[PDB]
Design goal:
Keywords: Transferase. This protein is an alpha/beta fold and 231 residues long. The protein is built from ten helices and eleven strands. It has a single domain, classed as Spore Coat Polysaccharide Biosynthesis Protein SpsA, Chain A (Alpha-Beta Complex). 35% of the residues lie in helices and 21% in strands. It binds sodium ion.
């Protein structure tokens, strides 16, 4: 039985309507609506993808196609209602996503309610030298966050109320730094912070075990945001 995956390709956007689409995920990339590269990759690694967003006629057809409830975590809750076990979440704008990258996550992810793959600066500039990312210096290195999230639906189920809370402060740095704590903020803002420290506080906050997965495959996070990208 193929495990579930969820693609949050939902999201209306600006330039996307230039291509007369609306959602960035439906913008063509190398011949097909961008998100299909993601779907192809998911099935490829043996998963059944649930698709949240507009479906003009996506190929490969996703296992289920839920509509858009107007938000990254709102869509996630919707899709969760339709899955079981450990699920891999992904946004529909990382067209470079490969099966190898997906299986790594699956195979190397530690046993935790929540696992978030992160990529080292070192490898991000191995294929995509141009790509400009928001990094963070940790004692263990310099990374950026993926666009994938591995969840244990059942374990996570109980952290959603906080998830909602923390997600609501995605647009309020000061507010968000309240939750994280000042000390920590500076620590990493200086590189003075470490990976387990990050993980241990994340856990403190959510109540569930949360870990990061150093993932050598940068296609896990290099998304497409504008025209230059598509080329
Ligand atoms: Na204060």
């Amino acid at each position: 039985m193929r495990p579930s995956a969820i693609v949050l390709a939902g999201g209306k956007e600006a330039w996307a309507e230039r291509f007369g689409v609306g959602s960035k995920a439906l913008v063509p990339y190398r011949g097909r609506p961008m998100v299909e590269w993601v779907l192809e990759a998911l099935y490829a690694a043996g998963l059944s993808p649930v698709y949240v967003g507009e479906n003009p006629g996506l190929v490969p057809a996703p296992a289920l196609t839920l509509p858009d409830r107007g938000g990254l975590l709102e869509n996630l809750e919707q899709a969760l209602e339709h899955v079981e076990g450990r699920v891999l979440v992904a946004t529909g704008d990382i067209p470079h996503l490969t099966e190898e990258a997906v299986r790594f996550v699956l195979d190397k992810a530690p046993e935790a309610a929540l696992v978030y793959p992160i990529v080292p600066k070192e490898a991000v500039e191995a294929r995509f030298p141009r790509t400009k990312r928001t990094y963070a210096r940790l004692r263990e290195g310099t990374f950026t966050g993926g666009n994938l999230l591995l969840l244990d639906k059942s374990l996570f189920r109980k952290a959603l109320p906080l998830a909602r809370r923390v997600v609501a402060l995605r647009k309020r740095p000061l507010a968000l730094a309240r939750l994280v704590g000042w000390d920590v903020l500076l620590k990493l803002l200086l590189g003075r912070l470490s990976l387990a420290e990050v993980e241990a506080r994340a856990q403190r906050i959510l109540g569930v075990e949360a870990r990061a997965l150093v993932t050598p495959y940068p296609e896990v996070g290099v998304d497409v945001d504008r025209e230059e990208d598509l080329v």
